[PDB]
């Protein structure tokens, strides 16, 4: 329930010592904001600054200290956003090289970084999205956790507490190994991991269900191929619903894992070792397909992220398109650029001819010049 | 044993078996190469041979499917020698009206399972990677077949267990459609727990030996560490006292009644177990490369063979079903020497680029020594 259907909208952003960007305030437009310039001038840095306001981290996976302008002691980003319930919401993110970060919403300091989700909703499309198709469980897992956490605060809560308990269990393993004086205390942590692990598996399944439905729709439209998604959960359950059952299986598996865990000083059982497999027609897309369909599968995955996010939050997000509008024979552009219709979008490119923005910004040397 | 003579199939006689013509084949004690364009003929032969070990089709086919088209029966007769037998005759007769006749040295076996393992084979196939790739049931059935060949007590138990389970499951739907029958349930539960406990103890024993063999082969082939985790349905990982395993199984049977009534299935028991195959602490089903999966499949089978020899004192015949298709002829030569003092049957497409001691060409169901 919201007071309006005003889409998410970034009125302006202010960047101070952020990457190579000069200290500046940028005011944006409704519709397509074209950001163009030579390679390495600051295009992706600006998208990274905008995406920071949504996630509280670099979409590139960079450490915070890497976003600080070389030889400075802090960076600071401030966005003013409009959303369905807010004519204006101020979002501030300051980070100092000594580790101190200060995140504020409407002038109130957030107690943790995760509390920044999703005051400002974005979906970012990037060439590296094909890595979610190609790389290991870790990549897919990090992606899934972020998709869900953005729309579901209780899951994010669970994930945070799970990781905390996991960390405690792992250090306990060290303490048991470093002595003879502890295998025992593991039971109570085991019980907790199974409870939180089961809640997480349940929600991951709910999302993957929705993911498969939406992706099957998109895939069948542009490639006429058939999508399946297999969730390799840690409970070994091929069809997950009874949370009771999953809890017991996870707990049994933890107990049977004790010797192995003492050897590796880690926990092989749980959500943090899971994966999901993406199947095209019947084959594993990670291995059995070419680069045409991986790029296609990546697109469908992200199109689905967008669709699920809108439906679950009742908000319309801002779209970030990083270096994904090059190439593109133009019926393959005619499809996407019209799909951007009712959104505010930020599109990076090499030229301002190819794509027509409603507002256009040239960046050279970290300096952003509105209107070429 | 009175000796250490290897298992050796001197000859086989097939009558109305699949597409095979009626014929006697005589084999050598080394490499027997079977080749040809044919897909079925090459395999039908391996199926006849493997029948003499397992008393079933390794293709999962019903017996009636092994019978040639317009015929009323098939018949397979093998002559074998093993550590204690200069010659042992094994005959398998099946008529389409149903009656199986299995005989060893002229004596009829009262049950099909008694054929295990008068004649030991291990069969290698590209399909073996599915044991690494696929789900609990594929691993479970493989385990059951490996153990059953060695241990006929286990095979027995497994039959009584399976029979009891189906009865129990038929009863679950009576309890839910009518409103009674939990009295038989408690009786079935006691029976499932008893047999289940015996099954679990032996599986644990086997998987321990499997872990040791497999980890040795893997450490030598790839210098990676192998672990096996046996997820027994008693939820213990402390498996040698059948008494306590019974109690645990019985308890869990009780606690999952509601589940069982809903799905009309039985959630607790060895019929739902699994074991994890881990490389360097990570689940091979989830984290392992394609190469790693094939290597692990190899190690699994090398281990099956090592444990079978150690447990029985017999050296099995090796069946290599189309595993030479995609190899190098330096890797083809490698293996050939590793076969050493076994009898082996190898199916291929060509006659060269592998060495063998007896070559057979199968075309149109006739197996012809030498082309
Ligand atoms: N912390 C930092 N301080 C100063 N300069 C930085 C910092 N981090 C990166 N840079 C530089 O800033 C540039 C990065 O600009 P980007 O926006 O990534 O390039 P871009 O080509 O405009 O974006 P894409 O991905 O091609 S659309 C490079 O020249 C980096 O060396």
Residue numbers in the entry:
A (entry chain A): -6 to 365
B (entry chain B): -5 to 365
Provide excerpts from the study.
RecF is a multifunctional protein involved in recombinant DNA repair, homologous genetic recombination, and DNA replication. To gain insight into the mechanism of ABC-ATPase RecF, we solved the crystal structures of TTERecF, TTERecF-ATP, and TTERecF-ATPɤS.
The structure of TTERecF-ATPɤS is also a dimer, that is completely different from the dimer of TTERecF-ATP and is thus another conformation of TTERecF. In the TTERecF-ATPɤS structure, domain I of the two monomers interacted, whereas their respective domain II structures were located far from each another. The dimer contact surface was 2613 Å2, which was 7.7% of the dimer total surface area (33774 Å2). One monomer structure (ATPɤS binding) was nearly similar to one monomer of TTERecF-ATP dimer, including the active site conformation of the Walker A motif, Walker B motif, and signature motif. The Cα atoms of these two structures can be superimposed with an r.m.s.d of 0.807 Å. The other monomer structure (no ATPɤS binding) was similar to that of the free TTERecF; the r.m.s.d of the superimposed Cα atoms was 1.121 Å. The structural and biochemical data showed that the TTERecF-ATPɤS dimer cannot stably bind with DNA.
